[PDB]
Design brief:
This is part of a larger assembly, with 5 copies of chain A and 2 copies of chain B.
Chain A lengths: L1 H12 L3 H7 L21
Chain B lengths: L1 H7 L15 E2 L15 E2 L6 E2 L5 E3 L9 H9 L3 H10 L7 E5 L4 E4 L16 H7 L6 E5 L7 H14 L10 E4 L3 E3 L11 H11 L10 H11 L13 E6 L7 H6 L7 E7 L7 H8 L4 E5 L5 H5 L2 H5 L1 H5 L13 E2 L6 E4 L2 E4 L16 E10 H6 L11 E5 L5 E3 L25 H4 L4 H12 L3 E10 L6 E12 L6 E5 L15 H8 L7 H4 L21 H12 L13
Parallel strand pairs in B: 1-4, 7-8, 7-10, 10-11, 11-12
Antiparallel strand pairs in B: 2-3, 4-6, 5-6, 5-16, 8-9, 13-14, 14-16, 15-16, 17-18, 17-21, 19-20, 20-21
The chains are: A mainly alpha (44), B alpha+beta (574).
The structure holds a molecule of 4 linked components (NAG-NAG-NAG-NAG), 1,2-Distearoyl-sn-glycerophosphoethanolamine (2 copies), a molecule of 3 linked components (NAG-NAG-NAG), a molecule of 2 linked components (NAG-NAG) (3 copies) and calcium ion (2 copies).
The site of a molecule of 2 linked components (NAG-NAG) has 2 residues of chain G, from β1.
PDB class: transport protein
Keywords: Cav1.2, Calcium Ion-Selective, transport protein
Entry title: Human L-type voltage-gated calcium channel Cav1.2 in the presence of amiodarone and sofosbuvir at 3.3 Angstrom resolution
């Protein structure tokens, strides 16, 4: 939650939000902490 | 002759969906092209595993296989495999036969897998460049004005160095510069012979230049057009070309070109280097108005392709000469790219003669398809000059017009050195005759007579260096030399005195022969001394391994086992 | 956004190496030198990719123009649109 | 060590902000 | 402008016509001065422009930084305002609004000074350690844009690779962005307060020191 | 603004249109610090003058 | 021997270092010997040799080689080695029917003088200088076949006609 709040404050300041949008696009792998078809099906 | 005829009857089919192309692409373990897995037997005469069933194809890394140009070459050159195979039928002792395409791909036979980073390009090899054009008189003009400071100066320095790599010994080069005043970048102050050593000085001097001043094409081009009309020094008396490395400008220097090369004897190749907004108009005009060409080099990755493309322009007069410009040329002694040792390569260009029956196109038919090449190993040449009938002090040696030694006892399979190696083999092994042994006032006279070609002999007294470079002893020598008829090589025989006669063993009886063999028994050494044997080529059935224990064991077990007739084991040495 | 679509419809494509000026050419591998050192080459694949924000259609143009109006990354888009040469080709340094 | 208290030494400078009537009134009203 | 003294024909022609412009302006100044012995705000500017132009011209003719002195030429377009009063009145209207914002400017200066001193106390040369993959200091083998790191006893970022953290590093942006002294700290604080690339400084500090404390400084 | 780095800067002051574009980019306040860093390294660098 | 290599000595400390160049243990006498024309030498360049690198894995290098041999046929050698504020007089006799020479000199400790050592080894270098070597190049002959300036050449295309 603190990191999400910091990211949203960064976007409100308008630092690189147009890049975080692209970095949150579908087609990303996610952390091994979260648990076949899981190649990169994670990101909306 | 086959590559010319086969290419003429080619249809240039655009896509390759239904009809594929089959070929063994080297350096491997996409649709449109199939693949071939070969047998790859292990064979002698090559240090590697080879296959006689087809030819291997090498495509450089920065060239994509499957493109229309490459896929067409892989089709009409597939007819060369039959000629490759049938060539070896008439001469089993035949080394690599390679066809280097102007596209960039080589098809060599027999097929062997390619030898980190693979930067091999066929069109940059010395055997390709010598057959794609004639010796030249290059003179590189480097713009060192203020506007080239920064990135585009480091691109000119790299481009000039890669331009010098396409020159050979027969070619003559010099590098100049101009910024409101023309000057030489080094100590040469005129055209030099562009050998291994001279290009090291020019490469080091062009790395020390700096950008400052005002551009002035009139003074730079006047300096260049003056160096090319020297005639006070030795030159090539052939292709004269000016290489201008700049970015852009506003003046065309029309008065200079109309003054010096009014009849257009000198070509002007112009390069526009770097990312800039300066006007490329005048630069493109000097190329077209002086029988030259224009090239753009915007990054390091474009340096290699552009700096070798100027041989396409220089090859136009060669193809117009017809079959007159089809002569076999032999390169300097270099190291093979396929781990084979010191070799020399034959060379014959291939022309594009489509439409020669009607004689109407002549648009791209003024460029060569590529350069052929067959490698002749130096070990084969040493096999034609046996040395065991004369003293250890005697030897054969062969020279070429530039003065380098094709054959010599002191020539060794490692690149020659230049300068002092300090830290912070794409060059030929060119060793002059006067550097292979001790120089003398009589050697230069003999060396001069051998170069132009004439028979003779001379008996004289010189000091000769010992095998280990620690002693010098003075003795008598007689050099007898004659020129090789067909080619341009002179062969000499250093035969000293006290060796005009040799002992030729004669015996048709086994009674003496049999009892001599037991003296070489390893278990008989205690009562007869420790015996060694010289690993000579008694016959191909034996094998030389340099350890000298098995060879001595192999030798004694061979003389008794093999019948004394020795069908394929020369009895003169035995 | 409609005007931008009319101006840069598909013109913003580029290849990994500036040498190749079309998608058919932009295939295979090429050699790039690390930190501009001629003695440090690396093979990298050739990729034919569009811009991060392009003007292919009206929605993409609206997204790109919004990111421009937020003053975020607009110089990069400007200097990439300056080089836009032709409807289906690669960039030319300071073309327009 | 710890440097939290050292920063206190700087904070006294803010007292210099309470000298101009206009700026003090503007800050207080906002 | 060309790098390292390069030039073309147009630059020479312009440098030639600059003499004509200088003589025209000097004649105008002499005529306007013989009318009356300059007290105007916008005429003193023309006078200093013309005198600096003459000084630069004579220095360029005599010595041959000279070229740096002619940066005064950029003040000539401003004189175009004085020609028409219609732009003059609107310029004065723009300027007169600056007086109420002097308090805001003083507040910004004070907060910048305070935050520069606080950052000087907190982050004092800590952005000088990075990971060197090569056995020695040769080309700082850490990707393309190296980031600051911390030693094992530190709470910053440790590169868990074959590389080790070793000091002797210029800084993040070629040693320009850091709180090494008062000037550098003040410049960094200003560049952060303009809200342009403050997250870069925040992340560099989060790598050089721990990630839990220094967010307060930049957020506040 | 011509350093040895492989990537030539786009926001430079070489021409009048390029200078106008760079000044406008600075006025919009987007990546003005990068231009300032380039200008600082254009001169001697992180020294006093 | 013929080559200036030690084979026997007297201090019994030279004899431990046998088969070594005499110039590396007695440079003062070695330099005098080559001056009185008993030991000639020819310096040669080897363009195929490997040298250890240096500050600025063995790479190719040019190495200067020196070899020593008898100058003249004379067998009776006598003189004084004037090393400075001293006097050393030696006698040298060459063995008959052999490539050896025997010399008789005073001790090294009699005079506190020691000039720079004379080394016969694979000394790395980079000569000869090519700046003045191209002034008088070795005689060479180029190919007699030439191909240029043909009339039928097109040359209608450059890199500017395309764009
Ligand atoms: C030896 O010389 C002969 C002729 O002297 C030469 O044969 C000719 O080869 C060219 C290929 O280089 C053929 O070119 C045809 O015409 C154009 C040329 O590109 C192509 O049309 C499009 O061209 C664009 C380039 O702007 C290209 O991007 C595109 O892919 C092309 N195709 C399209 C749009 O569909 C033709 O496709 C091309 N091929 C045809 C028409 O079949 C000439 O037709 C050839 N002429 C003859 C008489 O054969 C031959 O290549 C030379 N030898 C070698 C090894 O190159
Ligand atoms: C200043 C003027 C302000 C108005 C500017 C309006 C800007 C609208 C943005 C442009 C729409 C882009 C739509 C689009 O391309 O698809 C978005 C998404 C589908 O994903 P797609 O983009 O295809 O995936 C990546 C493609 N390579 O599909 C979607 O997620 C659909 C929704 C996307 C657009 C949302 C618009 C936000 C409006 C929020 C209103 C605020 C109050 C509520
Ligand atoms: C206009 C007005 C808009 C208002 C917007 C306010 C924005 C506030 C932004 C807050 C961002 C906080 C981010 C932060 O503190 O960083 C995350 C950090 C986690 O640190 P971590 O990476 O786990 O530590 C590793 C050590 N090397 O977190 C921490 O360790 C800090 C703990 C969380 C912060 C607590 C603050 C609330 C007070 C609670 C009592
Ligand atoms: C370049 O690619 C072409 C496309 O594959 C090749 O063309 C094929 O060559 C084959 C070899 O001759 C032909 O096979 C025979 O062709 C003769 C022609 O008179 C006929 O008997 C038959 O068509 C055929 N015989 C059969 C099928 O038993 C192919 O017809 C011909 N065309 C195709 C496959 O479409 C070229 O050979 C190739 N160039 C080189 C040098 O190999
Ligand atoms: C060699 O070059 C010179 C100048 O580049 C040519 O000009 C001669 O220069 C020398 C001395 O300067 C003199 O002989 C004459 O003044 C010049 N003319 C002639 C005809 O000699 C010279 O001709 C060239 N060739 C030779 C053999 O000197
Ligand atoms: C190899 O050694 C010989 C003998 O020391 C040298 O040649 C001598 O050179 C001098 C030059 O002043 C002459 O006076 C002698 O007559 C030469 N002696 C000969 C020719 O026997 C020289 O160092 C070398 N010889 C060469 C290079 O030919
Ligand atoms: C190279 O060819 C020439 C000419 O073809 C050969 O010259 C011959 O020389 C011998 C003796 O000098 C003459 O008897 C012949 O008549 C010459 N040949 C002709 C055709 O007249 C020369 O011998 C050849 N070289 C070698 C090594 O054989
Ligand atoms: Ca210039
Ligand atoms: Ca921003």
């Amino acid at each position: 939650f603190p990191q999400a709040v910091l990211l949203l404050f960064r976007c409100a300041t308008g630092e690189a939000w147009q890049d975080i949008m692209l970095a949150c696009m579908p087609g990303k792998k996610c952390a091994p902490e979260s648990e076949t078809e899981g190649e990169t099906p994670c990101g909306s | 002759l086959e590559a010319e005829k086969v290419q003429a009857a080619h249809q240039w089919r655009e896509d390759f969906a239904s009809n594929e192309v089959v070929y063994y692409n080297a350096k491997d373990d996409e649709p449109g092209s199939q693949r071939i897995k070969p047998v790859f037997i292990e064979d002698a005469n090559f240090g590697r595993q080879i296959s006689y069933q087809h030819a291997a194809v090498h495509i450089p890394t920065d060239i994509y296989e499957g493109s229309t140009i490459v896929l067409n070459e892989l089709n009409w050159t597939s007819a060369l495999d039959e000629v490759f195979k049938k060539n070896r039928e008439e001469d089993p002792s035949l080394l690599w036969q390679v066809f280097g395409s102007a596209t960039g791909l080589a098809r060599y036979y027999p097929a062997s897998p390619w030898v980190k980073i693979d930067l091999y390009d066929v069109r940059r090899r010395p055997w390709y460049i010598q057959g794609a054009a004639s010796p030249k008189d290059m003179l590189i003009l480097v713009d060192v004005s203020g506007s080239v400071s920064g990135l585009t100066l480091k691109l000119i320095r790299t481009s000039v160095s890669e331009m010098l790599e396409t020159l050979s010994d027969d070619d003559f080069v010099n590098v100049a510069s101009f910024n409101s005043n023309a000057q030489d970048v080094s100590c040469f102050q005129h055209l030099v012979q562009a050998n291994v050593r001279n290009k090291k000085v020019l490469k080091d001097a062009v790395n020390n230049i700096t950008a400052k001043g005002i551009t002035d094409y009139k003074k730079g081009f006047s300096f260049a057009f003056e160096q090319l009309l020297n005639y006070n020094v030795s030159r090539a008396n052939c292709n004269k070309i000016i290489m201008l490395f700049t970015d852009g400008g506003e003046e065309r220097a029309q008065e200079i070109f109309n003054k010096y090369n009014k009849d257009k004897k000198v070509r002007v190749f112009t390069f526009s280097v770097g990312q800039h907004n300066y006007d490329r108009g005048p630069i493109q005009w000097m190329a077209c108005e002086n029988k030259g060409y224009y090239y753009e080099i915007p990054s390091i990755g474009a340096i290699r392709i552009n700096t070798q493309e100027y041989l396409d322009v220089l090859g136009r007069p060669m193809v117009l000469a017809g079959d007159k410009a089809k002569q076999v040329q032999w390169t300097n002694v270099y190291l093979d790219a396929l781990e084979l040792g010191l070799v020399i390569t034959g060379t014959l260009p291939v022309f594009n003669i489509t439409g020669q029956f009607e004689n109407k196109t002549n648009l791209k038919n003024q460029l060569i398809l590529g350069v052929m090449g067959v490698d002749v190993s130096l070990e084969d040449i040493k096999r034609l000059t046996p040395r065991f009938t004369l003293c250890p002090n005697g030897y054969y040696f062969a020279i070429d017009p530039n003065g380098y030694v094709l054959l010599h006892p002191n020539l060794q399979p490692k690149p020659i050195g230049v300068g002092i190696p300090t830290i912070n083999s794409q060059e030929p092994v060119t060793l002059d005759f006067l550097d292979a042994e001790l120089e003398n006032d009589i050697k230069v006279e003999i060396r001069n007579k051998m170069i132009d070609g004439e028979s003779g002999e001379k008996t004289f007294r010189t000091l000769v260096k010992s095998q280990d470079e620690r002693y010098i002893d003075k003795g008598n020598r007689t050099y007898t030399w004659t020129p090789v008829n067909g080619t341009d090589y002179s062969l000499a025989l250093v035969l000293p005195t006290y060796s005009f006669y040799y002992i030729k063993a004669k015996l048709e009886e086994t009674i003496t022969q049999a009892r001599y063999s037991e003296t070489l028994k390893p278990d008989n050494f205690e009562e007869s001394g420790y015996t060694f044997i010289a690993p000579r080529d008694y016959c191909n059935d034996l094998k030389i391994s340099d350890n000298n224990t098995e060879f001595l064991l192999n030798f004694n077990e061979f003389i008794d086992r093999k019948t004394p007739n020795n069908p394929s084991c020369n009895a003169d040495l035995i | 956004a409609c005007i931008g679509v009319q101006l840069f419809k598909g013109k913003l494509y580029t290849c990994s190496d500036s040498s190749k000026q079309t998608e058919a050419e932009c295939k295979g591998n090429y050699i790039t030198y690390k930190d501009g050192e001629v003695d440090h080459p690396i093979i990298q694949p050739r990729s034919w990719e569009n811009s991060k924000f392009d003007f292919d259609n009206v929605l993409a143009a609206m997204m790109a123009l919004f990111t421009v109006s937020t003053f975020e990354g607009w110089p990069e888009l400007l200097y990439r649109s300056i080089d836009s040469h032709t409807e289906d080709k690669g960039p030319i340094y300071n073309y327009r | 060590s710890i440097t939290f208290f050292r920063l206190f030494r700087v904070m006294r400078l803010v007292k210099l902000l309470s000298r101009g009537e206009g700026i003090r009134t503007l800050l207080w009203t906002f | 402008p060309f790098p390292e003294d390069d030039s073309n024909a147009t630059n020479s022609n312009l440098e030639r016509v600059e003499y004509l412009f200088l003589i025209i302006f000097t004649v105008e100044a002499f005529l306007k001065v013989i009318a009356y012995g300059l007290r105007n705000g916008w005429n003193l500017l023309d006078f200093i422009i013309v005198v600096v132009g003459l000084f630069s011209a004579i220095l360029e003719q005599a010595t041959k930084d000279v070229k740096a002195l002619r940066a005064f030429r950029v003040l000539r377009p401003l004189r175009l305002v004085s020609g028409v009063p219609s732009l003059q009145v609107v310029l004065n209207s723009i300027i007169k609004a600056m007086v109420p914002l002097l308090h805001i400017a003083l507040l910004v200066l004070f907060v910048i000074i305070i935050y520069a001193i606080i950052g000087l106390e907190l982050f004092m040369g800590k952005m000088h350690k990075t990971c060197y993959n090569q056995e020695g200091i040769a080309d700082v083998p850490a990707e393309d844009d190296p980031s600051p790191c911390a030693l094992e006893t530190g709470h910053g970022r440790q590169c868990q690779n074959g590389t080790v953290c070793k000091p002797g590093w210029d800084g993040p942006k070629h040693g320009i962005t850091n709180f090494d002294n008062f000037a550098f700290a003040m410049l960094t604080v200003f560049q952060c307060i303009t809200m342009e690339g403050w997250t870069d400084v925040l992340y560099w500090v989060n790598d050089a020191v721990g990630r839990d404390w220094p967010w307060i400084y930049f957020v506040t | 603004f011509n350093f040895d780095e492989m990537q030539t800067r786009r926001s430079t002051f070489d021409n009048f249109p390029q200078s106008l574009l760079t000044v406008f980019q600075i006025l919009t306040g987007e990546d003005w610090n990068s231009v300032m860093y380039d200008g600082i390294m254009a001169y001697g660098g992180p020294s006093f003058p | 021997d013929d080559g200036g290599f030690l084979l026997m000595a007297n201090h019994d400390d030279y004899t431990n270092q046998i088969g070594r160049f005499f110039g590396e243990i007695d440079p003062s006498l070695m330099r005098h010997l080559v001056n009185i024309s008993v030991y000639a030498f020819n310096k040669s360049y080897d363009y195929q040799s490997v040298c250890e690198p240096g500050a600025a894995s063995k790479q190719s290098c040019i190495t200067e080689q020196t070899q020593y041999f008898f100058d003249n046929d004379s067998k009776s050698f006598s003189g004084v080695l004037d090393c400075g504020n001293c006097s050393r007089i030696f006698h040298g006799e060459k063995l008959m029917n052999t490539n050896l020479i025997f010399i008789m000199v005073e001790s090294k400790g009699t005079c506190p003088c020691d000039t720079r050592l004379l080394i016969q080894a694979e000394q790395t270098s980079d000569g000869p200088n090519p700046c003045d070597m191209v002034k008088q190049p070795r005689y060479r002959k180029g190919p007699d076949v030439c191909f240029d300036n043909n009339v039928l050449e097109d040359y209608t295309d450059c890199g500017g006609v395309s764009g």
